[PDB]
Design goal:
- This protein has two domains: 1-96; 202-582, no CATH class.
- It is 59% helix and 3% strand.
- It has helices spanning 14-43, 48-76, 86-95, 105-124, 134-144, 148-182, 189-195, 202-232, 260-263, 275-281, 285-298, 306-311, 348-366, 380-395, 397-402, 413-427, 430-446, 454-466, 486-489, 494-513, 529-541, 547-555, 563-582, and strands at 126-128, 131-133, 243-244, 328-331, 338-341, 468-469.
- Strands 1-2 form a two-stranded antiparallel ribbon. Strands 3-6 form a two-stranded parallel sheet. The chain has a two-stranded antiparallel sheet with strand order 4-5.
- Bound molecules: a molecule of 3 linked components (NAG-NAG-FUC), a molecule of 2 linked components (NAG-NAG) (2 copies), ligand EAL, chloride ion (CL) and zinc ion.
- Chloride 1 binds at residues 197, 495.
């Protein structure tokens, strides 16, 4: 570690800790920068030289975290928890967590190589027949092929190309992760991730939430299954069984918006898939990011700075570079550079993604004057919900009309149901998956799920929550969890399930704040500076206050709550139950063992 980046000595008291924290922040910004830059260079231009550079930068981070973490312990272990400055408690608390820096050198190099190589496998896997990439080629197939056999080729190809080679690396990764966090005092890496919510009842609270939401997911499931049955027939849909995992518009069956055309109940109302309008009108990526930006500035939030437009990668390069396509928002920790990396496609759901990713940028912008340690969401769930809150306003028919993507606007119940159904395909269908992914990973980290049951336990969770089955047999050579980006990327997932509930809480608060008197699902906070002021206060707090306190200031409750989500969807909940009863459906999948046959001359 460079001389200038090493800690000195401070007094062993709170006064000295302030100075410690100041000097830490200078050094950290410089180290975070060099690291975020090296990853950027990699993720936008995947080569061996850039990977070796990222690994060297991660190593420098680890030396840093170690020298400053050791020093925080040496000076402040007795006293940091009694400090008067709440923000300084959190900072020192962060600084003393070594994570992977607890590893000895050879194991840090191994850990870093594993992250690098899993990233590269996930992001450069192709399916050949001439080779298709996940984005855009396989995404597109899943979204709008309706050939059972072609969807299967893509689903299986993908899960095979990405899963199988990840498994040896994922096992090694898990061992090293656990080893590292055990020396911070955690029983496993999972306990560490769960500790961010700083809630003794965390697992219980989530299950109380999921139990309240499960009826909606079940009603929707049964409805969609019936729709699928009408198209794909009795051979490939069991009305009493899980849905084949490849028929729902998305590689992970995590969002079902792309099958909207098979379920929409009132096809004579305004068509709420504006994708073809966007294509007809000649939208490009730039436009999408501009329209998101303008939403933000209508709230008196900050615009994207020059550095964002000059630095971002908002399109897949055509120059034959390998990139990580999976959309992400980047803070370089220099208070100046913020960028999005996205292989933006021109569709309505990518319009949401854009807003999602811009939510992150906006958070980065508001809290950039906090100490580096506090430059994060009140919890990771907060960070994920910001863009999604705006996107709820954007998707409303009124707002789509105002940005010229919907030629007229109805305000009738048939339209409301169309709308709420679409939103349910996006939001309610995701709920089981948001919950299940980290359940799988907590199991793996704790040792409940060894390598020999990685795929067994994954599909148990898939069937249990989502009510889907693999469309071909899987076994333990397969590693289907690893064909989902967040797993090889080591990005926690429970934040999304938290986000998907929190976003309706935020929505309801901002709408009330904006003066909006009508049904929640027709609220548009566009141009509400009051709503903006309320959101800004949250963004600016970063992680400097307990999320339960920030939440209470914002929505009046100190806890995640399903009521807003439920009142948002209330009308389509009542509608779906009526339909499912009149069609004599079975809620759930009592024929849990059922799997569909192979197509006749498959794999051809
Ligand atoms: C795991 O399954 C793979 C995939 O094979 C297909 O799906 C299986 C579950 C099986 O039920 C069959 O429907 C299919 O073969 C098996 O892989 C291939 O199977 C044969 C026999 O080895 C052969 O054509 C290939 O070489 C196999 N290898 C691969 C991965 O392409 C595999 O043998 C199964 N068992 C184990 C322990 O991995
Ligand atoms: C992608 O990454 C490679 C490095 O992996 C970059 O290539 C180097 O670029 C400098 C300046 O252009 C040359 O002098 C070196 O000789 C190159 N090294 C290698 C290993 O080729 C390349 O510039 C990057 N490409 C893009 C489009 O950013
Ligand atoms: C669509 O019509 C409904 C029903 O008339 C509107 O909802 C009412 O809105 C007013 C003020 O805007 C409130 O005072 C009422 O309490 C609401 N009543 C009901 C029955 O919900 C709604 O605002 C209109 N929506 C749009 C798209 O603007
Ligand atoms: C598109 C988005 N990308 C992630 C990227 C996360 C990430 C973190 C750290 C490093 C790289 C990428 C993000 O939340 O922005 C994402 O994965 N999202 C959006 C909501 C649900 C979730 C999903 O698609 O699984
Ligand atoms: Cl999380
Ligand atoms: Zn996100």
């Amino acid at each position: 570690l460079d001389p200038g980046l090493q800690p000195g000595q401070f007094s062993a008291d709170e006064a000295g800790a302030q100075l410690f924290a100041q000097s830490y922040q200078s050094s950290a910004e410089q180290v975070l920068f060099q690291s975020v830059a090296a990853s950027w260079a990699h993720d936008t231009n995947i080569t061996a030289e850039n990977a070796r550079r990222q690994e060297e930068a991660a190593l420098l981070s680890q030396e840093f975290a170690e020298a400053w973490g050791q020093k925080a312990k040496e000076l402040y272990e007795p006293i940091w928890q009694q400090f008067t400055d709440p923000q300084l408690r959190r900072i020192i608390g962060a600084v003393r967590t070594l994570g992977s820096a607890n590893l000895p050198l050879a194991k840090r190099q191994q850990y870093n190589a594993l992250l690098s190589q899993m990233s590269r496998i996930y992001s450069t896997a192709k399916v050949c027949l001439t080779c298709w990439s996940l984005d855009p080629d396989l995404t597109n197939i899943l979204a709008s092929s309706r050939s059972y056999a072609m969807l299967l080729f893509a689903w299986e190809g993908w899960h095979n190309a990405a899963g199988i080679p990840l498994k040896p690396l994922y096992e090694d990764f898990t061992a090293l992760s656990n080893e590292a966090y055990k020396q911070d005092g955690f029983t496993d890496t999972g306990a560490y991730w769960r500790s961010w919510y700083n809630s003794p009842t965390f697992e219980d609270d989530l299950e109380h939430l999921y139990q309240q939401l499960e009826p909606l997911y079940l009603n929707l499931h049964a409805f969609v299954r019936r729709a699928l049955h009408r198209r794909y027939g009795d051979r490939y849909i069991n009305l009493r069984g899980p849905i084949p995992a490849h028929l729902l518009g998305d590689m992970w069956a995590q969002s079902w918006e792309n099958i909207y055309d098979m379920v929409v109940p009132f096809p004579d109302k305004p068509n709420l898939d504006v994708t073809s309008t966007m294509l007809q009108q000649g939208w490009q990526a730039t436009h999408m990011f501009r329209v998101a930006e303008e939403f933000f500035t209508s709230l008196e939030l900050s615009p994207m700075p020059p550095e964002f437009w000059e630095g971002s990668m908002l399109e897949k390069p055509a120059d034959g570079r390998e990139v990580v396509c999976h959309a992400s928002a980047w803070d370089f920790y220099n208070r100046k550079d913020f960028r999005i990396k996205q292989c933006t496609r021109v569709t309505m759901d990518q319009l949401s993604t854009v807003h999602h990713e811009m939510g992150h940028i906006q958070y980065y912008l508001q809290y950039k004057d906090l100490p580096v340690s506090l430059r994060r969401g009140a919890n990771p769930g907060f960070h994920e919900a910001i863009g999604d809150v705006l996107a709820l306003s954007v998707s409303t028919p009124e707002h789509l009309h105002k940005i010229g993507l919907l030629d007229r606007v109805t305000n009738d119940t048939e339209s409301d149901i169309n709308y709420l159904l679409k939103m349910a395909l996006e939001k309610i269908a995701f709920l089981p998956f948001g919950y299940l992914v980290d359940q799988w990973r907590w199991g793996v980290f704790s040792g409940r799920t060894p390598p020999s049951r990685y795929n067994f336990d994954w599909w148990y969770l898939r069937t249990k929550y989502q009510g889907i089955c693999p469309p071909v047999t899987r076994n333990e050579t397969h590693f289907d969890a690893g064909a989902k980006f967040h797993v090889p990327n080591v990005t926690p997932y429970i934040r999304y399930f938290v986000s998907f509930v929190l976003q309706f809480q935020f929505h309801e608060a901002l709408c009330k704040e904006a003066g909006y008197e009508g049904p929640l699902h027709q609220c548009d906070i566009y141009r509400s500076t009051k709503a903006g002021a309320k959101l800004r206060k949250v963004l600016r707090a970063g992680s400097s206050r307990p999320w339960q306190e920030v939440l209470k200031d914002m929505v009046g409750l100190d806890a995640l709550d399903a009521q807003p989500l439920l009142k948002y969807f209330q009308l389509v909940t009542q509608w779906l139950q009526e339909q499912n009863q009149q069609n004599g459906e079975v809620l759930g999948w009592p024929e849990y063992q059922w799997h569909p046959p192979l197509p006749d001359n498959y794999p051809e």
